[PDB]
Write a protein that binds this ligand. Structure first.
Ligand SMILES: CNc1cccc2cc(C(=O)Nc3ccc(C(=O)O)cc3)c(=O)[nH]c12
Length: 196
């Protein structure tokens, strides 16, 4: 199946030359760019008028989650490639959320839409299983939590609050109307960014 082959070549490509996709993997810039890429996806959903709140969280285990209250990534199985439209978005190259997926040792996807909660787990960009319904809900949105591969990233491996805060504040400025929360579980620090 062409599609599976393609996807794995893409993932492999990104892990072999991460500099070409995420930036420097020693100085922290690439590592923080992982967060910004995921956030940019949530910003699109806000720009489209479906997302009002985005929540960025620094977890104690040095992963980062991004939650929006948008529509939820479509979950219906694409006829054309045999898996959830969400998995296509998470894995197909073109920088795209697939790059962050490729360079994460684990990624967790939680989608709320059409009354159902769906969940999928990825490792180094590869799904452990197809997207599956775990429950019901009245809410909508997309939550992506990722744990960056320490095979890829060295030296600066811990997320730095201030670096995330500066960029998220910039993004709220550029995208007037979007409301962004940043919360650090390591010490309870939090901020709310919202402009005009
Ligand atoms: C944390 N959030 C987050 C992380 C990473 C990727 C995405 C991707 C989307 C997205 O693709 N939404 C979307 C919604 C509806 C439809 C439709 O046709 O109904 C098509 C696309 C998103 O909303 N949020 C994301």
């Amino acid at each position: 199946d062409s599609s599976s082959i393609k996807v794995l070549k893409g993932l492999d490509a990104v892990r072999k030359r991460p500099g070409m996709y995420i930036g420097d993997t020693d100085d922290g810039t690439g590592l923080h760019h992982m967060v910004f890429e995921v956030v940019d996806n949530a910003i699109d959903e806000a720009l489209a008028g479906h997302c009002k709140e985005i929540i960025v969280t620094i977890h104690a285990d040095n992963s980062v989650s991004v939650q929006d209250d948008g529509r939820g990534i479509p979950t219906g199985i694409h006829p054309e490639e045999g898996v959830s439209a969400a998995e296509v978005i998470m894995t197909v190259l073109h920088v795209g959320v697939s790059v962050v997926n490729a360079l994460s040792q684990k990624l967790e996807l939680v989608i709320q839409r059409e009354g159902k909660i769906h969940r999928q787990i990825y490792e180094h960009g590869v799904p452990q299983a197809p997207l599956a319904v775990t429950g019901e809900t009245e809410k909508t949105g997309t939550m992506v939590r990722f744990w960056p591969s320490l095979e890829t990233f060295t030296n600066v491996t811990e997320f730095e609050y201030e670096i995330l805060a500066k960029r998220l504040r910039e993004l709220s400025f550029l995208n007037s109307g979007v409301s962004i929360r940043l919360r650090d579980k390591r010490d309870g620090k939090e901020d709310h960014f919202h402009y005009e």
